[PDB]
């Protein structure tokens, strides 16, 4: 459908906002990132493609923390994701200043959804070219959400985005089938690494670095922390072992 | 601080003191406290140190801008109405203009002199003879006694001599004489032998 896709706020005769649909095409080109909701927290994993050996390992972090209990991972236009996360940090700080409590994840997800959606209202602005998997632990459990360029978001047992989303979603579905009682935080980290490695088979042309993050009540006391050192290497070893 | 004005049959005579005093001493004794708003309109002013000249020169620019714009000289009534409005606007502004003015002019269309007294509040009143501040305390008794509408310019000047002499005699301050200007059908001129 041409003619109606040159502007951001225009409905096509079918009611479809094409520019937002084109923004989704930007997301589908990004590196695959997933989020797994465990029985007491959430786990985030992102594939970081190694463009060249000259990138210093472990410095180009792509998972972001908001306040202290929300972690955000996104795929698509990385600058757009940072713009969205910068707003979330402002929204989270504003909520804490006025209400004194850390912003609830369902409340935070709405704050971001209103912002992302507001970018589809006017033709003087462009839609976000990122789908953001975000979540954390709040007063009433763990929450995992996923935004879209249109501003739509839902709660997920496990979310996947980026180029390997179709591959990753297959293994996320297997996790919920095999573990309906709830997956443990430590096992979720190992499974998160395995899913990213499997999803990378859609990007075999280039090497990648796995980055994991997670926020569990029992293990981080409800705060968002990165996987590093021994725990990261066990996940990498497990992911390679299953691949081999 | 002396500002006097007397309207006679054919002209308006405005007299204003020459002294300028700043605190302890007299800086100048030849100051002209008047501005020619139009070829036939003259404005005498008195008040606070800086407000008098800033206001007078600001008014003169607008009257000059009107004259050039319409190629027409505002009547003294219109000029006084314009001047009163600015004083009325300022009296209730951030920094009011504490300026008292006399506007003497010759209306070339009615062929009659006109004298208007406006104080810093914006109280415009047309008088046969006017004065601002305490200068009217000493002079009104003489003007009420001797003034007649049909005086000639020479009789009007003779009457100002009496008014100025009384101010010299009884007023404590030394105002260093007066500069006298006459607004007539021929324009504005200054009397030098006064």
């Amino acid at each position: 459908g041409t003619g109606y896709d040159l502007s951001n706020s225009v409905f096509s005769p079918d009611g479809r906002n094409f520019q937002v649909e084109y923004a989704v095409k930007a997301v589908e080109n990004g590196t695959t990132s997933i989020g797994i909701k465990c029985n007491d927290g959430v786990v985030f994993a992102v594939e970081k493609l190694i463009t060249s050996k000259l990138l210093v390992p472990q410095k180009n972090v792509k998972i972001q923390v908001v306040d202290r209990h929300i972690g955000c991972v996104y795929s698509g236009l990385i600058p757009d994701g940072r713009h969205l996360v910068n707003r979330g940090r402002e929204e989270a700080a504003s909520f804490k200043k006025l209400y004194k409590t850390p912003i609830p994840i369902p409340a935070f997800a709405d704050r971001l959804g209103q912002y992302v959606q507001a970018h589809t209202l006017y033709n003087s602005v462009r839609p976000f070219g990122v789908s953001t998997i975000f979540g954390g632990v709040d007063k009433n459990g763990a929450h995992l959400y996923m935004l879209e360029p249109s501003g739509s978001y839902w709660g997920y047992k496990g979310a996947a985005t980026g180029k390997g989303r179709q591959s990753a979603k297959a293994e996320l579905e297997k996790l919920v089938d095999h573990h309906p009682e709830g997956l443990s935080a430590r096992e979720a980290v190992k499974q998160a690494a395995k899913i990213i490695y499997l999803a990378h088979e859609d990007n075999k042309e280039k090497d990648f670095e796995l980055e994991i993050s997670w926020c569990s009540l029992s293990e981080t006391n409800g705060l968002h922390k990165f996987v590093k050192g021994d725990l990261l290497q066990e996940a990498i070893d497990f992911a390679q072992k299953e691949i081999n | 601080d002396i500002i006097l004005g007397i309207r006679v049959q054919d002209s308006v005579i405005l007299a204003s003191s020459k002294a300028v005093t700043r605190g302890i001493s007299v800086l100048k004794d030849s100051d002209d406290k008047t501005r020619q708003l139009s070829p036939h309109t003259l404005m005498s002013f008195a008040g606070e140190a800086g407000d008098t000249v800033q206001f007078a020169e600001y008014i003169q620019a607008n009257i000059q801008l009107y004259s050039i714009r319409e190629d027409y000289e505002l009547s003294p009534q219109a000029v006084s109405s314009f001047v009163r409005q600015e004083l009325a606007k300022s009296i209730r502004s951030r920094r009011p203009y504490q300026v008292n003015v006399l506007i003497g002019g010759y209306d070339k269309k009615k062929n009659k002199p006109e004298l208007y007294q406006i104080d810093y509040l914006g109280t415009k009143v047309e008088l046969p003879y006017g004065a601002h501040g305490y200068s009217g305390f000493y002079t009104f008794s003489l003007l009420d006694h001797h003034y007649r509408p049909d005086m000639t310019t020479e009789e009007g000047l003779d009457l100002l001599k009496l008014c100025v002499q009384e101010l010299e005699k009884r007023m404590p301050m030394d105002f260093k004489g007066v500069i006298v200007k006459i607004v007539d059908k021929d324009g504005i001129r200054q009397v030098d032998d006064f």
């Binding site: - | 300028v20 800086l27 140190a49 407000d51 800033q54």
Partner: protein, 212 residues
Amino acid sequence: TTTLAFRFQGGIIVAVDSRATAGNWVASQTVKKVIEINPFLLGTMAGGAADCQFWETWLGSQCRLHELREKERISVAAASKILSNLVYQYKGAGLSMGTMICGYTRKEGPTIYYVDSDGTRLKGDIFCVGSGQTFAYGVLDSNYKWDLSVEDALYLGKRSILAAAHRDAYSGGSVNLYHVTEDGWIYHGNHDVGELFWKVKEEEGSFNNVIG
């Protein structure tokens, strides 16, 4: 403070003292109370030292911009009105200023414009400002003439400040003489009031009430 500027056949003579006091404590003895706005315009400090120095330094830039645009030297009347208008904008905000904008121009001749913090702007032949102004007037009003020679005019300005320095507690230090001519102002040196008083006393016989 004591600053004077008077007009005469040879131009303008600007004489100022150099004492700055913080109460009765004499903070400085060698304050420069004349701002050299341009090679052709001279300022003068009285009252607010910072207000005079800052705005007359700023005024020099405005005069320079007029030079660049109009390609002609700004008149003293315009220079004093630029300062007078600005000083009026801040009226009531706390500015303190009494200054003479001395300059000599072809179309206008020697010109002194007295500008103060009230927004006043007066053209005159003789002006004195500061605490000791009444003493400077006394000497000037009696000995001032239009036909003064440059040598006699310089002495009269030097003598007028000496009289104010002697009698005024807040005036003294030294006398700074400036002479404004057709080709700019000329600095005629700094004369110490302490040394000048004894020199003047012997040559004139004046100050007979002072032993020495």
